[PDB]
A paper describes a structure:
Here, we characterized E. limosum Tub, a tungsten storage protein. Tub has a sub-nanomolar affinity for tungstate and contains a single TOBE domain first characterized in a molybdate storage protein. Tub enables E. limosum to accumulate W and then supplies W for two tungstoenzymes needed for conversion of lactate to SCFAs.
Additional X-ray crystal structures of rTub occupied with varying amounts of W revealed that tungstate accesses the internal type-2 binding sites through tunnels that are closed after binding. Based on the occupancy and B-factor statistics, a binding model of tungstate to Tub is proposed. Tungstate simultaneously binds to type-1 and type-2 sites indicating random binding, except for the final binding site located within the trimer center.
Numbering used by the authors:
A (entry chain E), B (entry chain F), F (entry chain D): 1 to 69
C (entry chain B): 1 to 72
D (entry chain A), E (entry chain C): 1 to 70
Amino acid sequence: MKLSARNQLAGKVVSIKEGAVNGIVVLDIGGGNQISSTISMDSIRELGLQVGSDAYAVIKATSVMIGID
Amino acid sequence: MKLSARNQLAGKVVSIKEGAVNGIVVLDIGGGNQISSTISMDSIRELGLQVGSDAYAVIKATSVMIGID
Amino acid sequence: MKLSARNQLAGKVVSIKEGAVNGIVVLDIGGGNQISSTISMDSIRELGLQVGSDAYAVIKATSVMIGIDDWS
Amino acid sequence: MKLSARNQLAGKVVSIKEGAVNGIVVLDIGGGNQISSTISMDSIRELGLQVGSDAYAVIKATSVMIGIDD
Amino acid sequence: MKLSARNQLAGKVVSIKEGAVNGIVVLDIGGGNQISSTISMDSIRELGLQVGSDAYAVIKATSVMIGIDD
Amino acid sequence: MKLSARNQLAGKVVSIKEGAVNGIVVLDIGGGNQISSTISMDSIRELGLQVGSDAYAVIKATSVMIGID
């Protein structure tokens, strides 16, 4: 399905640290960037996620803060 | 200050399209990826930021969803 | 793309409140319930959304709070 | 309290998945719709939530995305 | 309504910066702390918010990040 | 780093509830107020957080709702 979210970044799953209700999925999206996503275990199974899966990090623009040194 | 957020991606501001109270800053984070950030104009003033500034897109892991094809 | 968000509620657009950069879209999801979503006007244009369009309200489980009535 | 969040959908809890710190409450809100909510275990205790309790899924308008079929 | 969000901080509104669809309200929550909230102008109308209003800053635990000094 | 987030409230950690992937850190921020924050266990290690650490609750303005009686 097509999503309204402005951040939709392709990457590959390089870690999945499983837990009770939630889990943390890490995507390498190129450029030496990794995005970590905390989602429910139910979703990790439902989408089939495994180390090496192709995926997208989806982030709403209002979820992004800016920082500087 | 050092932040708990799992996602802290360094990038350069490639555009900043202003609006009334809010504003949308776009960061090139390398690998040809861009992050769009909606933050209040007060913060855009306070942090300085100009097209070409070094900055960070900071995203909490709980803000990221995963999608697949 | 298929999404990890546990809440993906089918509905029809019943209103679109335009603004300069943003807008408020309301979806009738059946059962007499409506969802409101604040998204960028750019996404509403790019997505084709119009009053009467079929769409989905997509919500992450961590974004939802639970409430109970004042007498519980 | 009366809450600023734009989405407040009434329903009955059909499951509560307990975990270490967090848990998932599922609401039937009628019309064949269910909302899943990930909240802390402390709130599920304090709110008295049990299977069959009447409750509300509360969602900010800014937390909702729109999707369409491609 | 009774709320699951653990952060429910009583305070008084000290300013309201109005905008097109949304607006920013600032609350004094005691201890010398101020919390800023961006919510739709529709909710600021519906709750009647004014400088001097009693209100609550409501924040979900999953929205709060932790920071420390270098 | 200097952050765009409107809410940065100084406090001391009063408990830390450990979990699988996440944990809940509570801050005394003065005025008898406590902020509860659910963040990843990796962030809790990395920041060194212990009961009694000085820290900040950092919250985006768009994450905050208002309620009245």
